[PDB]
Amino acid sequence: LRSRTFDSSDEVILKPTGNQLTVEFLEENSFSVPILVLKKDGLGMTLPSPSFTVRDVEHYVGSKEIDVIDVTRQADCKMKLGDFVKYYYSGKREKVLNVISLEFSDTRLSNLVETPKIVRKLSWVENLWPEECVFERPNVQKYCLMSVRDSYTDFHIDFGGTSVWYHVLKGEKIFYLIRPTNANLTLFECWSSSSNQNEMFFGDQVDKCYKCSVKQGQTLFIPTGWIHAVLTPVDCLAFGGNFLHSLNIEMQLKAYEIEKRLSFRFPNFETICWYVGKHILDIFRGLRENRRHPASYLVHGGKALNLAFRAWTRKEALPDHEDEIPETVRTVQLIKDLAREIRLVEDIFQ
């Protein structure tokens, strides 16, 4: 409804050029803060022209049951796309409706859009989800967002501890961003499992809340665990996607364990972790045999990953986690091997 007074993000949010946004760039900073890229050149995307409209979204997706958020009544419902488009172009919208969950990769719209290059290089699903396995591949890579003026999504952490990119093709979005310190995470879990949670503005409860506007042609990358709300001050059309990566594995697991203690979720999160575990073990093995040392974040990440592996497979917890373990993973052997590799890197006597 109204935008107020927010703490300065000058020392927090990074604004590199598209070309500066590389893996090494992220590795040097740990992908700890949101990243706003003002111009799309260098990001490696493919996008429809800025003249591409919501009317064209209906064309490629089909007049499709899409999930719609009733902002005004704070509730979730379903609509045909043609009905939403019709609503979107009405000069007398009675209510405030928001579409944020239209995943379009299995539709015709999918070949008009290519996601940022950094995302595809980092993404666990993209690179490490196997062709052949009993599980369904998680499909959370291409979303079409259609937000009317005065749309609002309250403070949340993205499902599965994912990181996210958003490109605004038309209009504007304003993100309200809170760093996932242990304190803020505690306050968030407290706020999220509270009764009348949706009466209290979470940005009041915390040390610092940053506001970041994302205008036409701009691209925002939000890292793991960052608590964010979104206001749409002008009718908006945006594309975005969600991804897991190896830069802060502990934070991904922490976000996932919060989502568990509350209750919408990254499908087969634990499955991809198990496959990532096997891969990380190979990376450690390859580096030691090559007489090189792994980067610090990978040692820390493998450690956190191995802690979760043990927690998921201990006797009291196993019934809740067994269904997610791939049949090609020897749980005990992987835990043992990951632990040995990590101990070898860290033991001062070798």
Q: Which residues sit at the interface with ligand AKG, rule CB under 6 A?
A: 98, 100, 145, 147, 151, 153, 158, 173, 228, 230
Is position 293 annotated in a ligand binding site? Answer: no
CA distance 259 to 264: 9
Instruction: Name residues whose C-beta falls within 8 Å of residue 88's C-beta, 6 or more positions apart in sequence.
Output: 54, 146, 148, 235
Number of residues near Fe ion (by CB under 5 A): 1
Is position 173 annotated in a ligand binding site? Answer: yes
- DSSP assignment of 179-247 equals ---HHHHHHHHHHHTSTTGGGS-GGGTSS--EEEEEETT-EEEE-TT-EEEEEEEEEEEEEEEEE--ST
By CB under 5 A, tell whether 270 contacts Fe ion: no
**Residue with smaller CB distance to Fe ion, 158 or 337:** 158
Is position 72 annotated in a ligand binding site? Answer: no
Which residues are 37's β-sheet partners?
A: 219
Q: How far is the CB of 173 from ligand AKG (least distance, A)?
A: 6
Q: How far is the CB of 96 from ligand AKG (least distance, A)?
A: 11
**Residue with smaller CB distance to ligand AKG, 36 or 342:** 36
Q: Which does 151 bind (CB under 5 to 8 A by kind): Fe ion, ligand AKG, none?
A: ligand AKG
Is position 156 annotated in a ligand binding site? Answer: yes
CA distance 221 to 210: 14
Q: What is the DSSP letter of 142?
A: -
**Residue with smaller CB distance to ligand AKG, 61 or 168:** 168
Token pair of 259 as six digits: 């989502």
Longest Cα–Cα distance of the chain, Å, equals: 73
3-state secondary structure of 22: coil
Q: Which does 306 bind (CB under 5 to 8 A by kind): Fe ion, ligand AKG, none?
A: none
**Residue with smaller CB distance to Fe ion, 158 or 259:** 158
Q: How far is the CB of 185 from ligand AKG (least distance, A)?
A: 17
**Binding letters toward Fe ion, positions 149-188, x by CB under 5 A:** ---------x------------------------------
**Residue with smaller CB distance to ligand AKG, 228 or 254:** 228
Q: How far is the CB of 285 from ligand AKG (least distance, A)?
A: 36
Angle between helix 249-262 and helix 269-289 axes, rounded to 10 deg: 160
**Residue with smaller CB distance to Fe ion, 51 or 198:** 198
- Looking at this protein, which amino acid is placed at residue 186? T
CA distance 155 to 201: 8
Is position 228 annotated in a ligand binding site? Answer: yes
CA-nearest of 26, 29, 32, 81 to 250 is 32
- CB closest to Fe ion, residue no: 158
**Residue with smaller CB distance to Fe ion, 13 or 342:** 13
User: Rounded to 10 degrees, what is the CA torsion of 195, 251, 215, 110?
Assistant: -100
Q: How far is the CB of 105 from ligand AKG (least distance, A)?
A: 16
Q: How far is the CB of 49 from ligand AKG (least distance, A)?
A: 22
Give the annotated binding-site residues for Fe cation.
Answer: 156, 158, 228
Binding site for Fe ion (CB under 5 A): 158
